[PDB]
Amino acid sequence: GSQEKAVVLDEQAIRRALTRIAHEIIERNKGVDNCVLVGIKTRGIYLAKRLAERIEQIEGKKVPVGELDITLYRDKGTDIPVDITDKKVILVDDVLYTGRTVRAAMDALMDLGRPSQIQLAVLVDRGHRELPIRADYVGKNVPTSKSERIVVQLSEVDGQDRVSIYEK
Amino acid sequence: SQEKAVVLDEQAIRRALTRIAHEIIERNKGVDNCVLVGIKTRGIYLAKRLAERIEQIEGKKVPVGELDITLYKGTDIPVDITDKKVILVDDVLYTGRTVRAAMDALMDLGRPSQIQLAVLVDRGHRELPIRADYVGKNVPTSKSERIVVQLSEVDGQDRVSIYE
Amino acid sequence: EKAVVLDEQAIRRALTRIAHEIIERNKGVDNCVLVGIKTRGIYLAKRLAERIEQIEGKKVPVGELDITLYRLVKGTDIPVDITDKKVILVDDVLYTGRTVRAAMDALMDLGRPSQIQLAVLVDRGHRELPIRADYVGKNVPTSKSERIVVQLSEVDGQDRVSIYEK
Amino acid sequence: QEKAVVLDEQAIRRALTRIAHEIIERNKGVDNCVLVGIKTRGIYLAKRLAERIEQIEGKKVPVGELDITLYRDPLVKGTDIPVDITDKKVILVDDVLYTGRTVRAAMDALMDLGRPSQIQLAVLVDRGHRELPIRADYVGKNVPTSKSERIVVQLSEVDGQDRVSIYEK
């Protein structure tokens, strides 16, 4: 839809969620040795870069960031600067809806290499999964109806940081 | 390896599977356009048990298919799965790599409208972002343990244990 | 009325599922007592006792608590001693958790149960206390300007759960 | 004796830092929040969290204390909360959540002192086996245990080291 129904994360809430996710990643992996962030185009890639910056500030370690170009089911090229074999790949996307985009991303990764794990971080989980896929790290669970959509704006691409529900 | 604990006896297995049958009916609002697909030997028997239980509850026969997948390939699914809700059934969810392969096989056969996952045991230690929709029992384990699932059809008794 | 979130078949499927969860988690229903929070919680409890009986061939005793719903304990009517029993408290909707907090305190005045479990048809979010249901029919997202209305046939003439802007 | 270490010192630090960020996130800052620790180790965890939150947000959250016999091993012995909690968000802090009986008693004590807007719960460890419908909002680690085990939390301020272990007993 075209009408903003609710703002569900403002700029500050986005920052607080990403910071908390960074801390989770570090906590669950016990540091970030052998981790690679891989963002899904376009907004996922910017979120991955933000997480890498935050992690570097927290831990003093640089996590490499790769990119996947995938058509988003919700609405097939690769650029990963390190070998992912035996690494822990943390996929990053803005919104988890059906899970079909993540399924395709997993398949791509598993063609490029044999990671030891693939984790998933998303800014929003909006429900309505169609595959048995779940994010390891979630910024905000945002309930939605099927007629609603999530709009993520990020300052790098869109001029402001905002997440909204839009409705017809 | 020695047995370290028993985590589900025969009655607990029966209770978990009956509850899972009721969850499947509940979440899908009936079982129209659903298809159960069992993974490997024990997932297939669990799928059959769930189909029999669902038939008794709802009076509808859900088709049961099979997938043969190597242990972390062949398929036998008796209906078209395009636009159907496929409920994959496995005995244990560990890394998620078997399920990832199973999803691949399914997508090769057809275009299901969704894929759900039912397991008797989730033992943690996922290596992919895969979760079961329906779980009999969450069984915490260390990496130096394994789950052993016995089902009467092939093993003589219904039991789940931790070994190692 | 904004959205019907459970119709009659969905209510039946949720309560049947909850009965099987209760039997599963308790490994049967020996030494269990259902206690409903008046009025709709009491009918839900009775439905659950009827389902459990069909499954297990045991009739779980059903008690009642009369409590002002935050969304004060006025009276209790529990037909068995609850000391060393597993009490399953039943309400229609979990919102803040303040009512359940008051119910727990009442129960603990009437006896020393081994445990207190909580079954609710709907969890609408917005907790204000660290209270969670063990058994939930449906998680129903709501805003603070909305309310959940539950109708059960025995006392309200139909089975329906809706969100109202109220 | 000791069966397994489940959080070492670095894992305790990382959990508490993460929890501080969760507290800030969920409450959108820490305005009108009050941390209340359960003795003996919950209070030190509350003070750690307050120090972390001050570093992150620049703001000092007041810390109170509750002295309660711990069911896991309830009587409310005493309270010492330095601000009024009416209409505030109280974040109760304990080291281990087991049956929930202690928290139940803590909630009662809080309600005797004031009318908080909400009561949140942070614990370092949730070891399962609840006997009441109580759950923590913030958890350091979910630690599966059997009924024949206990959790032992050591904190440097009380015990001379930071460690969480499972013991047979």
Burial of A168 (0-12, 13-18, 19+ CB in 10 A): exposed
Phi, psi angle pair for C64, to nearest 5°:
-135, 145
Reading the block at residue D146, the tokens are: 């059997």
Rounded-to-integer distance, Cα D46 and Cα D61, Å: 10
Rounded-to-integer distance, Cα A140 and Cα A92, Å: 14
Nearest Cα neighbor of C35 from C111, C154, C156, C119 is: C119
Nearest Cα neighbor of C7 from C163, C164, C161, C165 is: C161
Q: Is D136 helix (H, G, I), strand (E, B) or coil?
A: coil
Chain B partners (3+ C-beta pairs within 8 A): A, C
CB count within 10 Å of CB D27 equals: 17
Rounded-to-integer distance, Cα D106 and Cα D92, Å: 8
Q: Is B106 left (phi over 0), alpha (psi -120 to 50) or beta?
A: alpha
Nearest CB to C130; choose among D108, D117, D136: D136
Instruction: Give residue numbers after which chain C breaks (C–N above 2.5 Å).
Output: 71
* CB contacts, 8 Å: C14 with chain B: 26
Cβ within 8 Å, pair C130-D104:
no
User: In angstroms, how far is CA C7 from the centroid of its own chain?
Assistant: 18
Place of tokens 């129904």: A5
DSSP class of residue D103 equals: H
DSSP class of residue D119 equals: E
Class of CATH domain A1-168: alpha beta
CA angle D101, C140, C108 (to 5 degrees): 20
Strands D89-97, B64-68: pairing kind: unpaired
- Pseudo-torsion of CA A121, A125, A131, A132, nearest 10°? 60
With b for 16 or more beta-carbon neighbours within 10 A and e for fewer, the A99-129 pattern comes to: bbbbbbbbebbbebeebebbbbbbbbbbeeb
Rounded-to-integer distance, Cα B161 and Cα B4, Å: 7
Q: Alpha helices of B79-139 — where are they, by DSSP H?
A: 97-109
> B1-164: which CATH architecture?
3-Layer(aba) Sandwich (3.40)
End-to-end CA distance of chain B: 5
Nearest CB to C16; choose among B11, B15, B22: B22
Strands C86-94, A137-141: pairing kind: unpaired
Strand partners, D120: D91
Instruction: Give residue numbers after which chain D breaks (C–N above 2.5 Å).
Output: 73
A15 Cβ partners below 8 Å, 6+ apart? Answer: A161
Chain C, window 49-108: residues with a beta carbon less than 8 angstroms from a chain D beta carbon: 89, 100-101, 104-105
CB count within 10 Å of CB D122 equals: 26
Rounded-to-integer distance, Cα D11 and Cα D18, Å: 10
CB count within 10 Å of CB C18 equals: 28
Do the beta carbons of residue B36 and residue B47 sit within 8 Å?
yes
Q: What is the 3-state secondary structure (H, E, C) of chain C?
A: CCEEEECHHHHHHHHHHHHHHHHHHHCCCCCEEEEEECCHHHHHHHHHHHHHHHHHCCCCCEEEEEECCCCCEEEEECCCCCCCCEEEEEEEEECCCHHHHHHHHHHHHHCCCCEEEEEEEEECCCCCCCECCCEEEEECCCCCCEEEEEECHHHHCCCEEEEEEC
Q: Is B83 helix (H, G, I), strand (E, B) or coil?
A: coil
Strands C160-165, C146-151: pairing kind: antiparallel
Rounded-to-integer distance, Cα C79 and Cα B9, Å: 34
Cβ within 8 Å, pair B131-A132:
yes
- How many separate helices (H) and strands (E) can be counted in chain B? 4, 9
In chain D, domain spans: 1-169
Q: Is D30 helix (H, G, I), strand (E, B) or coil?
A: coil
Cβ within 8 Å, pair A12-D21:
no
Chain C, window 14-43: residues with a beta carbon less than 8 angstroms from a chain B beta carbon: 14, 16-17, 20-21, 23-24, 27
Cβ within 8 Å, pair A20-D15:
no
Residue type at A132? P
Strands C73-77, C3-6: pairing kind: unpaired
What is the Cβ-side half-sphere exposure of residue C1, based on CA atoms within 13 angstroms?
Answer: 9
Is D113 near chain C, with CB under 8 Å?
Answer: no
Whether the ω angle into residue C39 lies within 30 degrees of 0, i.e. cis, is yes
Residue of C nearest to D136 (CA): C130
Rounded-to-integer distance, Cα A136 and Cα A164, Å: 22
Residue type at D132? L
Place of tokens 């024949």: D148
Cβ within 8 Å, pair B128-A107:
no
Strands B134-138, B146-150: pairing kind: unpaired
A118 Cβ partners below 8 Å, 6+ apart? Answer: A88, A89, A90, A91, A106, A109, B127, B128, B129
Rounded-to-integer distance, Cα A138 and Cα A132, Å: 16
Nearest Cα neighbor of B72 from B49, B46, B87, B91 is: B91
Cβ within 8 Å, pair B23-C16:
no
- Pseudo-torsion of CA B24, B26, B32, B38, nearest 10°? 0
Do the beta carbons of residue D167 and residue D2 sit within 8 Å?
yes
What is the Cβ-side half-sphere exposure of residue D56, based on CA atoms within 13 angstroms?
Answer: 26
Cβ within 8 Å, pair D133-C128:
no
Do the beta carbons of residue A124 and residue A152 sit within 8 Å?
yes
Chain D partners (3+ C-beta pairs within 8 A): A, C
Contacts 24+ apart (CB under 8 A), C55-63: C55/C19, C55/C20, C55/C23, C56/C23, C56/C28, C56/C29, C58/C28, C58/C29, C58/C30, C60/C29, C60/C32, C60/C33, C60/C34, C61/C33, C61/C34, C62/C33, C62/C34, C62/C35, C62/C36, C63/C33, C63/C34, C63/C35, C63/C36
Residue type at A141? N
Rounded-to-integer distance, Cα C155 and Cα C153, Å: 6
Do the beta carbons of residue D53 and residue D61 sit within 8 Å?
yes
Burial of A60 (0-12, 13-18, 19+ CB in 10 A): exposed
Q: Is D25 helix (H, G, I), strand (E, B) or coil?
A: helix
Reading the block at residue C141, the tokens are: 């997202």
Reading the block at residue B135, the tokens are: 């779980």
Burial of D31 (0-12, 13-18, 19+ CB in 10 A): exposed
Q: Which of D104, D117, D121 to mutate to test the interface with C (most CBs of C within 10 A)?
A: D104
Cβ within 8 Å, pair B128-A135:
no
Q: In what order do the strands lie in the sheet with C73-77?
A: C73-77, C62-67, C32-37, C86-94, C115-123, C135-139
Q: Which of D90, D92, D119 to mutate to test the interface with C (most CBs of C within 10 A)?
A: D119
Residue of D nearest to C25 (CA): D129
**Experimental method, per PDB record:** X-ray
CATH topology of domain D1-169: Rossmann fold (3.40.50)
Place of tokens 């037909």: C79
Q: Is the dihedral of CA D24, D25, D26, D28 positive or negative?
A: positive
Rounded-to-integer distance, Cα D65 and Cα D77, Å: 11
Cβ within 8 Å, pair D92-C128:
no
Rounded-to-integer distance, Cα A54 and Cα A16, Å: 11
Cα distances (Å, whole numbers) of residue C102 to B6, C77, D106: 39, 15, 14
Q: Cα Rg for chain C, rounded, in angstroms? A: 15
CA angle A81, A152, A63 (to 5 degrees): 25
Reading the block at residue A58, the tokens are: 């927290």
Cβ within 8 Å, pair A20-D22:
yes
Rounded-to-integer distance, Cα D120 and Cα D137, Å: 6
H/E stretch holding B145 reads: none
Rounded-to-integer distance, Cα C58 and Cα B62, Å: 31
Q: Which of C101, C105, C117, C120 to mutate to test the interface with D (most CBs of D within 10 A)?
A: C101
Do the beta carbons of residue D82 and residue D48 sit within 8 Å?
no
H/E stretch holding A73 reads: none
Cα distances (Å, whole numbers) of residue A60 to A16, A66, B13, D15: 20, 19, 49, 18
> C1-166: which CATH architecture?
3-Layer(aba) Sandwich (3.40)
